[PDB]
Amino acid sequence: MQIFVKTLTGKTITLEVEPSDTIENVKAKIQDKEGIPPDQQRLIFAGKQLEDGRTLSDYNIQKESTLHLVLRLRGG
Amino acid sequence: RKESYSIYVYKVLKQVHPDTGISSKAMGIMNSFVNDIFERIAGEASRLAHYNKRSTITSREIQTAVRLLLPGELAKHAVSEGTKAVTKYTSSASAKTRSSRAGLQFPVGRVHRLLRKGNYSERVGAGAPVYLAAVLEYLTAEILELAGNAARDNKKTRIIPRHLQLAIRNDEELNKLLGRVTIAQG
Amino acid sequence: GHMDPVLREMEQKLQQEEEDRQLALQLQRMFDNERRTVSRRKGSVDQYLLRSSNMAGAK
């Protein structure tokens, strides 16, 4: 299964993941593509926020899906 | 060559011109360029520190060394690059990463470690690696842009060592900087 | 392409894409609000510096 991740800048990156893959795993993959910390990245599906501890299957995401990227702002 | 800036240079090429690409050999050459520049600047900065009797190296020492190594046009632009990098670093409030806080593609933290490892000085500042890092990124982008122009002249979209060498020899400014450096010759 | 189904798909996809972007924008704005610093109007261009530059010509 493959999914497309778009960002607020207007950029799109293809990503290959399975329904059992966790969001946290996806965060690390994004860090490799962008070079941005995974904590500072937010993934949304159908305009709904996504939890790192939750899996793709939890949000009922099938093949060919679009996810939007947002930036987390925290002082750690 | 010692470090792995092949990935970093690739990113610069994408922002400067997505159409034009770079060969794997060309990337390696750029890596050696970074190492060569680092050594020359590092030694020059260390000498300045001794003159000022300052163990800790700062942006001020690097700034003087940068101007001496870079031609007139390049030197002026270099000042804005390093100065802004320091300002951006200082401007950022929340950020635990040196590179992220500075906003530089090249590993800012790695540069700081290299300066200390070189045993040039007992202590190294934070604004110094940031300043130097900004200069290195500028040089990388400038070389790639010039190479693209030569590539277009040769009806080629990909950048090769021949293009890189041609671009350097096409401008006296870079030639002076690389006067003591040979890309590849018998 | 006589059928040109891409145009129909783009219109539908754009509506859903903008929906996510709008919601995403709100999260981005809310996170920035937490910082306590809010700007009225901001705009800047980030590009690699060059020895020569020509402002004339727009782009």
Quote the DSSP letter at residue A19: T
Residue B84 and residue B137 in contact, taking contact as beta carbons nearer than 8 Å: no
Beta partners for residue B159, in sequence order: B22
Residues 6 or more apart whose Cβ sits within 8 Å of residue B122 = B55, B56
Residue B140 and residue B12 in contact, taking contact as beta carbons nearer than 8 Å: yes
**Method for this entry:** NMR
Residue A30 and residue A44 in contact, taking contact as beta carbons nearer than 8 Å: no
């090769």: which residue's tokens?
A: B160
Domain count, chain C: 1
Interface membership of B126 toward C (CB under 8 Å): no
From the number of C-beta atoms within 10 Å of its C-beta (0-12, 13-18, 19+), residue B102 rates as buried
Residues 6 or more apart whose Cβ sits within 8 Å of residue B36 = B181
Chain A residues with CB under 8 Å of C24 CB are: 8, 42, 44, 47, 68-70
Chain B residues with CB under 8 Å of C35 CB are: 93-94
Quote the DSSP letter at residue A60: T
| Owning domain of residue A25 | 1-76
H-type alpha helices, chain C: 5-34
Q: Report d(CA B3, CA B136) in Å as an integer.
A: 13
What topology does CATH give the domain B1-186? Histone, subunit A (1.10.20)
CA angle B117, B118, B120 (to 5 degrees): 115
Domain count, chain A: 1
Sign of the Cα pseudo-torsion (B85, B42, B174, B145, in order):
negative
Residue B112 and residue B56 in contact, taking contact as beta carbons nearer than 8 Å: no
Chain A residues with CB under 8 Å of C16 CB are: 46, 66
Question: Residue B137 CB: number of other CB atoms within 10 A?
Answer: 22
Interface membership of B138 toward C (CB under 8 Å): yes
Q: Report d(CA B94, CA B7) in Å as an integer.
A: 26
| Owning domain of residue C32 | 1-59
